[model samples]
Target: ANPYERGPDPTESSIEAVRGPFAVAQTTVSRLQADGFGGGTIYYPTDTSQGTFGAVAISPGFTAGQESIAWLGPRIASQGFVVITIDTITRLDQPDSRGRQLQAALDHLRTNSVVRNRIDPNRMAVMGHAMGGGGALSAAANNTSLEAAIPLQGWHTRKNWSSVRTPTLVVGAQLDTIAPVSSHSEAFYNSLPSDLDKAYMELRGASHLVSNTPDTTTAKYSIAWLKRFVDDDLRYEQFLCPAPDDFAISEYRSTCPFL
Candidate 1:
C-alpha cells in the first residue's frame, strides 16, 4: 500500500544479495562541467515502471577520490535510488566542505542532471567515508529534511550531533584508529536525538579502510537504512529492527520501535 516502496517484499536473502532487484545503469559528470561539487558518477534503475526514486550523494574521505565511494553508487542504486559518488573540489577538502559538495551534487542531480526526471527531489540523503562520513553528519545537521544519513567510520572535530534531525545510521570499525568507535562513531550516534530514528553498528576487528572495499554486512544494513528512510518503505524495517545478529557485527544500538 506504500506508494514510495519499490522492489519485492523484503527477505534476509534479498538484502544480502550482491545487487538488489533492479538492474542499474550509469552516467558520468566531468569536473569542468560540474556545479559546486567536483564531477562524479550517477547510477539509476532502468525500470521506470516504479516511478521516481529517492537519491543519495556519497563523498569519499580526505585526499581520496570518487573511486573510494564508487561501489555504493551501483549497489545502492540497484536497490532503488539515484546514487551519486562524488569527488571534492580538492582532494584536501575538510568535512564541512565535503558536506557542501555532497549537497551540491544532489542539487545538480535534481536540477540539471539528465536523470532528474527519475528522482523524487523531496527525498534525498547523504553519505561518506571517514572525513566524508563526517561530511554526511555535517550535511544532515544543516538539512533537516534529508531522509537519511549513513556515515561510515566518519570523522569530525565537532563530536556532538544532538541537533541532527535526519534519520541516521552511523557505522564504525572496531579497530579504526582514524575515527575510533570510542569517540568518533559512537559519539556521533550518542549525540543524535535519542528518540530519532538512529542506529550505530561497529564492525568487529575492522579498520578505517573498510568503506573502500565490498563488505556484505555494511551493504546489507546500509541498503536497509536507505530503503526504510528514503523510500519510507516500512517493509524493510523487519531486517533492521529486533537488531541483526551476526559474527561480523561487534555491537549494535538503536532506538527500538522505529516508526
Candidate 2:
C-alpha cells in the first residue's frame, strides 16, 4: 500500500478546478524566523485525519517576489500537500542562490515550521518560476532524494541535468522569448537521464509569466506530476500517460506508459 496517498481519486475537472478536495489553511513565516531562506507562506490541508501530506517549496523568478508564485501555495496544497511559496534573500538572486534557499525553506518547513508535524519530510519536492525554475533544477540535482521537481518556464545556462534523481515535469511557454521552450525548458528536459521519469509540457500561446497566473494546463499537469511522484499515487497515471494533447498545449513529451 502507498502510505503517502491522500485526497479523492482525481478527475479532469477536479484537477482543473481552482481548488482540490482538501480544505486548506495557511501560516506566514516571518523573515526573522526564517532559518536559511527568506520568509514564506505555508499552505497545508486542514484535514489531518488523512495522515501527513507531502511538501513542496516554490520560488519566484528574477526580480519577482513570493507573490509571483503565491497562487500555487493553496492551489497545490489543497490537493493534499504542504506548500511553501518563498521569497529569496534578494529579488535578483541567481538560480544557485534560489536553489539553496529552496533547500533551506524545506529544512525549516519539516523541522521548525508550524506545519512540520503535518508533513512527511521524506516526500518533498521543489518548484520555481523562470530563474526560480532554474533553481528547481539546481535543487533537484543537489537533492537526489527529492520526490519530484517542476520547473515553470525555467531559465538557466548550465543545461545538463544528469545528476537529477527526481521525477521531473518541465513546463515551457511556447512563445516565451525570455525562457523559450527550445532553448531552456526543452533543453533542460532533454538533459535529464533518458531512463528517468520526466516530461515536458509547452503551453499553447503562452508567455514567460504563465506560471505567475493560474492556468488549467499547467495546474493539472503539475498536480498530476506531484501526485504521481510525491504521493506515489498511481491513480494519476491516466492523466499523464499517453501524453496530453489539445488546444491549450503546443507540444507534449514524456517517457510515457508512466511505468
Candidate 3:
C-alpha cells in the first residue's frame, strides 16, 4: 500500500542538512476556472530524474493570502511533494468555505498538465494555518480521499472533528492568544477517531505565526508525517514512533501504535 517506492529518512538531522536532490520551480495556477477558485501559487520539484511525487494543498490563516503561507510551498516541494498555496476568494471566509477551496485547489493540481503528470494524484494531503488550519481539517473531514492533514494553530468554534478520517498531525502554539490550544487544537485532536493515526505537538513560547515560515523543528515532523502517510514511505518510521521532543516542544500526543 506504500505510495512511494523511494525517499529519504526525514527523522535524522543529517537528512535535513542538505537541500533535496530536486530543483524547484514556482507558478501561479493558470486554470483557475477548472475549480472555480481564486488565485494560487504552485511549487513543484522540477528534477526529471525523480518520478511522480505526492501533492499537498496549503491554505493561510484568516485575513491572510498565499504570500503569508508561501514559504511552506517550496520547503515541502523540495522535500519531494508538489505544494499549492492558495488564496481564498474572500479573506473573511470561514473554515468550511476554505475547506472547499483547498479541495478545489487540489483538483486543479491533479488536472493541470504542467504538474499533474509529475504528481501522484492518489497521494495527497491538506494543511493550513489558524482558520486555514481548521479549513484543512474540514477538507479532510468532508473528503476521505486525502492521505493526511496537518493543522497549525488551527481554530474552529465548533468541536465537530468526528468526521475527519484521514491521518492527521496537529500543531499548536503554546503562546497563541488568537486560537488557544485548550479550545482549538487540543479539542480538535481529541475529537478525532481514537483508533486513527494522529499526533499533536505544542510549540512552547511560539505564536500563531510559527508556521508562517519554514522552521527546522516544524519541518522535521511535518515532512516526516506526510512522507510516512501520504508517500507511505517507511524511511520515516523511526521519527513517528516515539514522538520527538526537545526544548521547543511543550506537549506531545500520538495514537501511533509503534509507541
Q: lDDT per residue, candidate 3, 1-259, as tens digits? A: 4547444444477335334546789878744454655678888888756589889998888889888888777777888889998888888989888889899999888778789788889988999999999899999998998999999999877776888889999999999999999999999999998878999999989988888766767777788888888887777867777767578789998987632
- In model 3, where do residues sit more than 4 Å from their true spots? 1-3, 9-11, 14-18, 30-34
- Per-model TM values vs. the true structure: 0.98, 0.98, 0.93
Q: Model 3's lDDT to the true fold?
A: 0.83
| Candidate 1 lowest-lDDT run of ten | 107-116
Clashes by residue pair, model 2:
none
Candidate 2 per-residue lDDT over residues 1-259, each given as its tens digit? 8878898788898889899999999999999889878899999999999899999999998999999899988999989999999999988999988999999999998676479789999999999999999999999999899999999999998899999999999999999999988889999989899989999888899988988888889888899999999998999988998768668988888998765
Cα deviation at 149, candidate 3, in Å, is 0.2
Q: Is candidate 1 or candidate 3 better by lDDT?
A: 1
Model 1 lDDT tens row, 88-165: 999999999989998899889877557978999999999999999999999999899999999999999989998899
Pairs that collide in candidate 3 are none
Q: What's the CA error at residue 119 for candidate 1, in Å?
A: 0.4
Q: Candidate 2, which segments miss by more than 4 Å at Cα?
A: none
* Overall local distance difference test of candidate 1: 0.91
